[PDB]
Design a protein around this ligand. Structure first.
Ligand SMILES: *[C@@H]1O[C@H](CO)[C@@H](O[C@@H]2O[C@H](CO)[C@@H](O[C@@H]3O[C@H](CO)[C@@H](O)[C@H](O)[C@@H]3O)[C@H](O)[C@H]2NC(C)=O)[C@H](O)[C@H]1NC(C)=O
Ligand SMILES: *[C@@H]1O[C@H](CO)[C@@H](O)[C@H](O)[C@H]1NC(C)=O
Ligand SMILES: *[C@@H]1O[C@H](CO)[C@@H](O)[C@H](O)[C@H]1NC(C)=O
Ligand SMILES: *[C@@H]1O[C@H](CO)[C@@H](O)[C@H](O)[C@H]1NC(C)=O
Ligand SMILES: *[C@@H]1O[C@H](CO)[C@@H](O)[C@H](O)[C@H]1NC(C)=O
Ligand SMILES: *[C@@H]1O[C@H](CO)[C@@H](O)[C@H](O)[C@H]1NC(C)=O
Ligand SMILES: *[C@@H]1O[C@H](CO)[C@@H](O)[C@H](O)[C@H]1NC(C)=O
Lengths: 53, 170, 109, 170, 170
C-alpha cells in the first residue's frame, strides 16, 4: 500500500541521495547505481581528544 | 589537564562551533567558539556537499533489455554497455569522495591556523607564544578585552605601556 | 597569570571516512551518499498501481490465455511485473515472432 | 584611502601585473608590479589552461543512426550509448572546471603570501609589520634601496646601524 | 659551498630519507634525515599510490566482436562503444596522474616547512634565522643537544641564560 518515486526488483528507495548499491535495474526518479560499499564525505574534522581528554 | 589547543589537540568541552577560544582570566575560564569563522566554514562545506549532489543529476532509470538465442552478440553489447557505465561511475564517485575528503581535512587545519595568526598579529609583544596554540598575556585583562580580541578590535595602545614593564621581567 | 587559547572541536563520534593519503580516519561529523535501504515491497510509483501479471508472461497476458484474467481497468499502469520463470505463457505451443521487440513497445505504455 | 594591501584588498591603480608593491618614499609614491613572480604565475596558469585543452582531444564527429519499426531495441541501445557518453563528459568537464578554479584561487593567495614573506625575511628588524601587508621602514630609504628590495638584494648591513637607533625610540 | 638548505636547495649528501638536518658542531658535521617525518610521509605516498591501483580494478578482458556485410550499423555501434570507453579511461588516467603529481609536490614542500617551523618554535631567541632554512645557535651545543632538537626535546631553560648574554653582543 506504499507509494514510491524509485522502484527496484528487490524493493523501493528514498531517492534523496545521489548513489545506490542495491540494484542497477530501476524505474522512476532514482539515484545512479554504483558498485561501491562505502561512500562517506567528511563535513567536520579529525576527532582528536587532547591532553587527558 | 594543562588545557591548550590547536597544536596539542581537540577541545571536548567546546560546543558552539568547530573553531574557538579558551581564555584564562580572573573572571573565570571556559570555551567560546568563533561562529563568524565557523559559519564562513559551514557555508563552504554546505556548498561543497550540495555541489556534489546538484551536479550528479538524479536520473530516470530504464535497464531491462531481452535478447533471443540467435542474438547473444547484442546481449553481450548490452552487457558491455551496462557494466561499462557502472564501471566509470563507481570509479568517478569513489575518487571524488577520497580526493575531496582530503581537501575538506586540509581546509579546516588551514582555517584554524589562519585564525591563530589573526590573534598573533593583533596582540604582538603584549603576549608570549607559550607552548602550542596559546598566548600568555603580558598585562592581565578584563572579559571586555577578551571579547575585544575575539571580535578583532583588542586596542593595542591601551595595554602596550602596561606590557612594556611586565615583558622586561627577565 | 592571564592566558588565551585557539583550538578545534572534538566529540564522541565513530564515523570513519577515507582519503587519498589516509584511510579509516575517525571524524567529528560526516555525511553518507550510498543507499542500501530497500523495503522489499513493490510500491505504486507516482501513485499509479503497476501491472502485477502473476504466473503469466507478457505473451500470455496480451494473447489472453484463459488463466490470465486481468483484461479489466488494467489498461493503466506505471510499470510491468513478471515472475522470472512465468508458468502461464502460450497454451497451444509455437513461436511468438519478434517477441522481444513487442516487449519494448509495451515497455513504453 | 590609507593605501596598504594584501590582507586589506586589491589595488585598482596597479596595471603591470597581478602581484606588486606600493612604496612610500620622499622621492614620490606609486605602484610597480613584480613581473618575475607574475610571469612564473602566468606560465603556471597558461600551462594549467592549455593542459586542459591539449588533453581533451578535438574529435571527428559522426552520430546520426537510423532504425526501423521492428528495431526499437537497438534504437534504445544507441540512445543509451549516446546519452551515456554525454552524461560522463558533462560531469567530467563541470567538475574539473569547479575543482581547478578552486586550485587557481588558492595558487594566487599562496603566491602573494610567499612574496610577503620574501620581504619580511629580507628586511627583519629594520621595519615594523604595520597593519596588513605593509612595512614601515625604520631608516628612510632612496628609490635605489626600494628597487634593491624589489629585486631581492636590499643589503641589510647598510641600514642595520641606522635602524638600531630609530627602533629604540620607545 | 656554504651548506644551508630548504630555501636554498637539495642535499646531495643526505641518504637516510627525504627530510633532514645538517648541523655544525665542534664535534664534527654531516647529515641525518628525520625518519619519523620521512615515514609519516612515505606512508602517505604509499597509500596515495596503492589507492590508485586498489580502486582501478584489474578486469578480465573480452573485446573481439564480428559483424557481416548487412550489419555495419551494429559494427559502428560496437566501434562507438569500444572507442568511447578507451576515450573516458585515457582522459581519467591522464588527468589523475597530472593532478596528483601536483598534490604530491605540494605535500612535500609543506612537510619540509612544517618541520622548519617545528624547530623555530622549539629554539626561539637562542638562535638567529640566518639565511634560508638554517639557524645560528646563540649558545654552542653538544651532539646530545643536537639530537635533543632532532627528537623535539631540546630543553629551552638550560641554554636560555647562556644565549641571553651572547645575543646582547650588538
Ligand atoms: C498454467 O500454469 C499451470 C501451473 O504451472 C499449468 O499447470 C500444469 O501444467 C503441466 C503441463 O504443462 C502439468 O504437468 C503434467 O504432470 C503430469 C504428472 O503426472 C504428467 O503426467 C504430464 O505429462 C504433465 O507433465 C501440471 O500437472 C499442471 N498442473 C499444475 C497445478 O502444475 C497449466 O498447464 C497452465 N495453463 C495454461 C492454460 O497456460
Ligand atoms: C567589538 O566589541 C566591542 C564591545 O564593546 C565593540 O565596542 C566593538 O565595536 C566591536 N567591534 C566590531 C568590529 O564589531
Ligand atoms: C556522546 O555520547 C552520547 C551517549 O551518552 C550521545 O548520545 C551523544 O550524541 C554524543 N555526543 C555528541 C556530541 O555526539
Ligand atoms: C578499517 O578498514 C577496514 C577495511 O578492510 C575495515 O575492515 C575495518 O573495520 C575498519 N576499521 C575501523 C576502526 O574503521
Ligand atoms: C501459480 O502457480 C503456483 C505454483 O505452485 C500455484 O500454487 C498457484 O495456485 C498458481 N496461481 C494461479 C492463480 O494460477
Ligand atoms: C638588483 O638591482 C641593483 C641595482 O643597482 C643591482 O646592483 C643588483 O645587482 C641587482 N640584483 C640582482 C640579483 O639582479
Ligand atoms: C630524546 O632523546 C633524549 C636522549 O637523551 C631522551 O632523553 C629523550 O627522552 C628523548 N625524547 C623523546 C620524546 O623521545
Amino acid at each position: 500500500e506504499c507509494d514510491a518515486k524509485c522502484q527496484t526488483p528487490q524493493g523501493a528507495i528514498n531517492s534523496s541521495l545521489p548513489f545506490q548499491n542495491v540494484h542497477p535495474v530501476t524505474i522512476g526518479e532514482c539515484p545512479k547505481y554504483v558498485r561501491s560499499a562505502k561512500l562517506r564525505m567528511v563535513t567536520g574534522l579529525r576527532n582528536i581528544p587532547s591532553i587527558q581528554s | 589537564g594543562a588545557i591548550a589547543g590547536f597544536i596539542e589537540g581537540g577541545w571536548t568541552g567546546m560546543v558552539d562551533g568547530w573553531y574557538g577560544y579558551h581564555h584564562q582570566n580572573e573572571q573565570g575560564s571556559g570555551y567560546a567558539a568563533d561562529q563568524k569563522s565557523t559559519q564562513n566554514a559551514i557555508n563552504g562545506i554546505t556548498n561543497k556537499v550540495n555541489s556534489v549532489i546538484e551536479k550528479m543529476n538524479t536520473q530516470f532509470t530504464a535497464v531491462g533489455k531481452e535478447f533471443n538465442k540467435l542474438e547473444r552478440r547484442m546481449e553481450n553489447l548490452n552487457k558491455k554497455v551496462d557494466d561499462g557505465f557502472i564501471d566509470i561511475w563507481t570509479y568517478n564517485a569513489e575518487l571524488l569522495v577520497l580526493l575531496e575528503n582530503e581537501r575538506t581535512l586540509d581546509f579546516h587545519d588551514s582555517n584554524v591556523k589562519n585564525l591563530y595568526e589573526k590573534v598573533k598579529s593583533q596582540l604582538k609583544n603584549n603576549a608570549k607564544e607559550i607552548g602550542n596554540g596559546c598566548f600568555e598575556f603580558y598585562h592581565k585583562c578584563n572579559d571586555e578585552c577578551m571579547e575585544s580580541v575575539k571580535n578583532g578590535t583588542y586596542d593595542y595602545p591601551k595595554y602596550s605601556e602596561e606590557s612594556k614593564l611586565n615583558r622586561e621581567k627577565i | 597569570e592571564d592566558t588565551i587559547c585557539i583550538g578545534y572541536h572534538a566529540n564522541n563520534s565513530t564515523d570513519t571516512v577515507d582519503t587519498v593519503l589516509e584511510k579509516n580516519v575517525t571524524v567529528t561529523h560526516s555525511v553518507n551518499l550510498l543507499e542500501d535501504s530497500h523495503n522489499g515491497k513493490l510500491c505504486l510509483l507516482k501513485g499509479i498501481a503497476p501491472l502485477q501479471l502473476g504466473n503469466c508472461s507478457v505473451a500470455g497476458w496480451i494473447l489472453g490465455n484463459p488463466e490470465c484474467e486481468l483484461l479489466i481497468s488494467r489498461e493503466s499502469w506505471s510499470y510491468i511485473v513478471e515472475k522470472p520463470n512465468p508458468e502461464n505463457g502460450t497454451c497451444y505451443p509455437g513461436h511468438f515472432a519478434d517477441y522481444e521487440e513487442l516487449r519494448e513497445q509495451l515497455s513504453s505504455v
